[PDB]
Amino acid sequence: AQIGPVTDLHITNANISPDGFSRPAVLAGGTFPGPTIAGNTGDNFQITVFNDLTDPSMLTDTSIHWHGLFQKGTNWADGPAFVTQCPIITGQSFDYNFNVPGQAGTFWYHSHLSTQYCDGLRGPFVVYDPNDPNASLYDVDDDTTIITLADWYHTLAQQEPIGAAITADATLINGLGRSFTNTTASPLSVITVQSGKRYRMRLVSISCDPNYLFSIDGHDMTIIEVDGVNSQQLTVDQIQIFAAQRYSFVLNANQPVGNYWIRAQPNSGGQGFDGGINSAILRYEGATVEDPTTTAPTTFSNPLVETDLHPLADLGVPGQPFRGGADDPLVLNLAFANGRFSIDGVSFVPPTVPVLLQILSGAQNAQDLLPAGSVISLPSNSVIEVALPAGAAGGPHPFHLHGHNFAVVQSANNATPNYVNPIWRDTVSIGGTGDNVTIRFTTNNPGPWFLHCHIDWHLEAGFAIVFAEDIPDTASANPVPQAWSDLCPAYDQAHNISA
Ligand SMILES: *[C@@H]1O[C@H](CO)[C@@H](O[C@@H]2O[C@H](CO)[C@@H](O[C@@H]3O[C@H](CO)[C@@H](O)[C@H](O)[C@@H]3O)[C@H](O)[C@H]2NC(C)=O)[C@H](O)[C@H]1NC(C)=O
Ligand SMILES: *[C@@H]1O[C@H](CO)[C@@H](O[C@@H]2O[C@H](CO)[C@@H](O[C@@H]3O[C@H](CO)[C@@H](O)[C@H](O)[C@@H]3O)[C@H](O)[C@H]2NC(C)=O)[C@H](O)[C@H]1NC(C)=O
Ligand SMILES: [Cu+2]
Ligand SMILES: [Cu+2]
Ligand SMILES: [Cu+2]
Ligand code: NA
Numbered sequence: 001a002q003i004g005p006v007t008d009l010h011i012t013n014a015n016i017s018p019d020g021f022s023r024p025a026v027l028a029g030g031t032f033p034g035p036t037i038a039g040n041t042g043d044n045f046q047i048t049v050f051n052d053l054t055d056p057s058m059l060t061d062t063s064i065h066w067h068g069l070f071q072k073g074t075n076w077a078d079g080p081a082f083v084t085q086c087p088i089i090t091g092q093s094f095d096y097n098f099n100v101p102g103q104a105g106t107f108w109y110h111s112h113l114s115t116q117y118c119d120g121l122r123g124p125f126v127v128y129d130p131n132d133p134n135a136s137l138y139d140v141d142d143d144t145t146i147i148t149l150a151d152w153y154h155t156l157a158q159q160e161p162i163g164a165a166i167t168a169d170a171t172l173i174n175g176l177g178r179s180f181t182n183t184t185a186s187p188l189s190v191i192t193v194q195s196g197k198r199y200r201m202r203l204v205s206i207s208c209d210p211n212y213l214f215s216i217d218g219h220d221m222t223i224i225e226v227d228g229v230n231s232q233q234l235t236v237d238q239i240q241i242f243a244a245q246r247y248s249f250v251l252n253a254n255q256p257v258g259n260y261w262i263r264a265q266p267n268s269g270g271q272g273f274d275g276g277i278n279s280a281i282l283r284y285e286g287a288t289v290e291d292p293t294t295t296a297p298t299t300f301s302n303p304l305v306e307t308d309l310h311p312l313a314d315l316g317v318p319g320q321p322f323r324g325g326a327d328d329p330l331v332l333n334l335a336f337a338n339g340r341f342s343i344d345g346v347s348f349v350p351p352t353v354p355v356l357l358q359i360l361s362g363a364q365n366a367q368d369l370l371p372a373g374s375v376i377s378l379p380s381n382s383v384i385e386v387a388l389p390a391g392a393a394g395g396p397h398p399f400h401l402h403g404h405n406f407a408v409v410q411s412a413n414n415a416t417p418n419y420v421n422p423i424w425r426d427t428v429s430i431g432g433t434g435d436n437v438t439i440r441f442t443t444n445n446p447g448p449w450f451l452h453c454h455i456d457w458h459l460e461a462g463f464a465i466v467f468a469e470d471i472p473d474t475a476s477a478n479p480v481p482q483a484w485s486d487l488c489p490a491y492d493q494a495h496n497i498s499a
Contacts, residue, residue, distance in 0.1 A: 002143050003029070005039030006046045011056070011062050011121065013055045019170035019179040020186035021154055025120035026058045026111065032175050033148050033206060039127050041104040044090075049217070057156055058119040061087035064067040064096065065229060066125060067244060068105075068228050068426045070403055074098040075356055075405025075447030075478045081113040082350035083450050083466055084489040085484065086357075094483055101322050104129035105228030106146075106202040106246040115157035118208040124148060126202065130357040134224045136198075137233070137322055141200035146172055147191065149214065149241065149264050150206045155332060163461040165394065167270045168210065173262060173280035174355070180270030180277055188291075190278040191262065193253040200224075201251045203417065207243035208456040210266035211396065214239045217260045217284055218293035220302070221249035223309065227425035229405060230312035238300040242398035244427040244454040257284040257290040273313035275480050306411040309423035317407045318442050319383040321419035326385035326440060332465070334430070336392040340462045341453070346373035347462030348452075352499055355466050357488060359474045362482075366468050375494025378443050380470035383408070386451075387438045390430045394458060399429040403449035403469065405441040427454055446470035446477040 016025050017034050023199045027032030039045060045066075050383075053060045065079030077098045079082040088094045093291045104127045111121035124146050129135075151168040153160075160166045167311035170179045174189035187301055195197060203214065203222070218409075223234045225248035239247055262280040263273065270277045273296075282290060318328040333344050351358070351370040361367050366377035378384055388399055394411065405426045410417040412431030417438065430437040470477070493497050 001035045002038040004037040004045060004047065005043045007037065008048045008050060010052050011051045012052045012060065013458040016120070018152055018172050018175055020178055020184040021169070021179055022057060023154060023156070024058070026053065027118055027120050028123055030330045032120050033150065034121065036124040036126060036143055036146060037109060038126045038128065039100070041127055042099065042101050044097070044099050046097045048093055048095045049088060049119065050394065051088045051090050053090050057158060059114060059116050059158065060090040061113060062111055062116065063087045063113045063122065064109055064121070066096070066107065066109050068107040069098070069100055069103060070445060071098055075169070076480045076484045077472070079112045080402065080450045081222065082354050083448055085354055088274055088417055088487065089112050089490055089494045092490065094487065100127050103127055103228060104132065105225050106204060106248055107203050107228060108206055108246070110206070113162065115208070115460050118153060118157040118456055122150065122206040124202070124204050128486050133228060135305050136200040137224060138200045140197055144192070144200045145199050146204065148204045149212050150208050151208050151210050151266065152231055160457060164457070166209065166457045168266065171212070171264050171266055171269070171278045173264055177279070178275055178277045183275040183277060185276065188276060189209065190283050191280065192283050192285060192400040193251065194285045195251050195253050195257050195266070196276040197252045200255065203239065203241060203247045203249065203250050205241045205243055205245050209243060209267050211240055211398070213388050215263045215296065215300065216251070217263070217292065217296060218255045218261065219251060219282070221251060223247050223304070226309055226340045227405065227427060228421050229424045232310045232312055232422065234308055236302050236304045238303040240304060242396070242427060242429045244398060244400055245425070248491065253284065257286050258263055259287050259290060260294050261292045263296060272323055306408065306423065307414055307418065311423045312426055315407070315424055317409060317419045317422065318440055319385065323417070324385065327382035330388040334388060334390070334392045341392065341458055342462060343465040344373070346371070348374050348464035352497065354488065355468065359468065359471055360480065369468060375448070375466045375468050376429070377466050378469040380473060382443050383440060384443060385434055385438060388430045390435045390437065391433050396429045396431055396453065397453045397455060397458065397463070398427050398429050399451065400454045401449060401451050403445050404441045404449060405407040406441040409440055410438040412437060443469050446473040450474055
């Protein structure tokens with residue numbers, strides 16, 4: 001069952017064996033992935049998160065981010081530790097009480113403390129549209145049509161060296177899959193369809209690191225949504241999906257009744273499909289209960305290319321049709337050396353006082369804010385351009401902005417900008433050496449918004465900055481509840497920290 005929009009959510013430790021190997025984890029709702037939280041557009045979500053964690057090897061504190069939801073007027077509920085709150089301590093709870101005006105699509109939730117979401121705290125978050133403009137394109141859209149893609153590690157996250165190239169031990173599709181080494185024939189996920197029906201498959205990357213080449217043997221996929229943004233229909237036979245991205249695609253169950261492999265090939269870790277790694281099963285009702293015998297093609301003739309995507313609505317692009325054609329045009333210097341990432345010469349290390357609480361206590365400008373050099377102010381009601389030139393080791397890096405979606409004016413592997421009709425999204429691959437992926441948005445959401453690589457190991461190694469958007473209006477725009485004001489005193493008392 002789905003839960004929400006008003007629900008408790010308990011965060012616990014438990015052993016799980018999603019690839020046949022048992023390890024302890026950090027779970028929401030007792031499962032990996034966590035239960036789907038759902039509601040309708042404009043609903044009030046009140047997710048009361050109960051921190052019941054006791055195993056210090058995966059951290060007993062926690063904080064949860066609602067990835068892709070704008071949190072306008074509720075910056076305090078966004079979740080990134082030491083940006084918008086102090087963590088919730090064990091044996092305490094916290095009500096994330098916010099609204100989702102003007103958004104409908106496929107999202108997810110995850111821990112936003114350290115690398116804790118890698119240890120299991122990740123699940124889908126779906127905001128349905130009762131008047132969806134795409135409703136007539138499919139028959140079925142429900143919990144059975146969500147497809148999650150996850151990396152899974154046998155080593156616990158807090159044992160992963162900072163700044164290292166860290167590699168997974170299994171790909172999990174809907175929570176199940178097989179290990180790349182010592183492979184055992186543990187259960188594969190089954191996605192069941194009825195011949196002749198059309199499905200809204202909601203594809204969610206809950207990855208901590210790899211991107212996946214996703215395909216379904218014998219089938220193609222008609223994209224209708226990108227990171228929450230409705231798209232024109234685009235039919236493809238393969239989707240390369242980077243960490244934290246989402247797509248909806250229509251699957252037409254138009255092939256002969258049978259079993260078909262679902263494939264998700266990561267960019268690192270096990271390559272291919274030997275022993276049923278990197279695999280799940282598409283089963284038609286009436287098919288024999290047996291593994292597929294289908295083949296992938298040697299090459300895919302209609303892969304997704306990001307410049308082919310266009311919004312369903314006439315979204316356009318803010319600003320003027322040339323580089324630097326914005327009120328506030330920025331170019332970030334994104335670098336890596338010696339185990340640490342930096343942005344504009346500064347490696348992110350979380351501050352003791354969350355950025356939002358520094359601003360509510362009266363800090364006047366971005367040079368008053370800690371960490372020094374890690375906070376950039378943005379002016380209100382202005383067009384922002386951010387160029388993100390690639391080259392830093394460990395690519396391709398999927399960059400994500402909290403509080404906002406953005407026009408992708410220039411995409412990976414293509415030097416030509418698009419000032420007319422590019423897709424809007426919230427997490428974008430910045431590509432490879434010499435690329436100049438560039439995003440635009442307008443500042444209508446006061447508060448501190450994290451900008452970071454969504455390879456969680458990179459975030460931990462410093463690949464982040466904070467956009468302090470409209471500092472002067474942050475306090476008036478984001479009234480805080482007493483339970484939020486109580487978080488830092490409780491956390492600092494529990495950890496014997498002075499502030
Ligand atoms: C990605 O696109 C951005 C623009 O969106 C390019 O930024 C431009 O970068 C050049 C230098 O690489 C800038 O010119 C330099 O300015 C300084 C003074 O600030 C001057 O001392 C130098 O002699 C040089 O003129 C320019 O201001 C900046 N913005 C523009 C042109 O709009 C960036 O180079 C592109 N990166 C890649 C890798 O393609
Ligand atoms: C590299 O990125 C650029 C920019 O996003 C892509 O260029 C765009 O290509 C599209 C598709 O061909 C062009 O749209 C076309 O326009 C005419 C109408 O003028 C229409 O008859 C065609 O059916 C189609 O809609 C678009 O104008 C063009 N934009 C720019 C700024 O050049 C390009 O396709 C990408 N390269 C690759 C290899 O995908
Ligand atoms: Cu995220
Ligand atoms: Cu986010
Ligand atoms: Cu990265
Ligand atoms: Na425009």
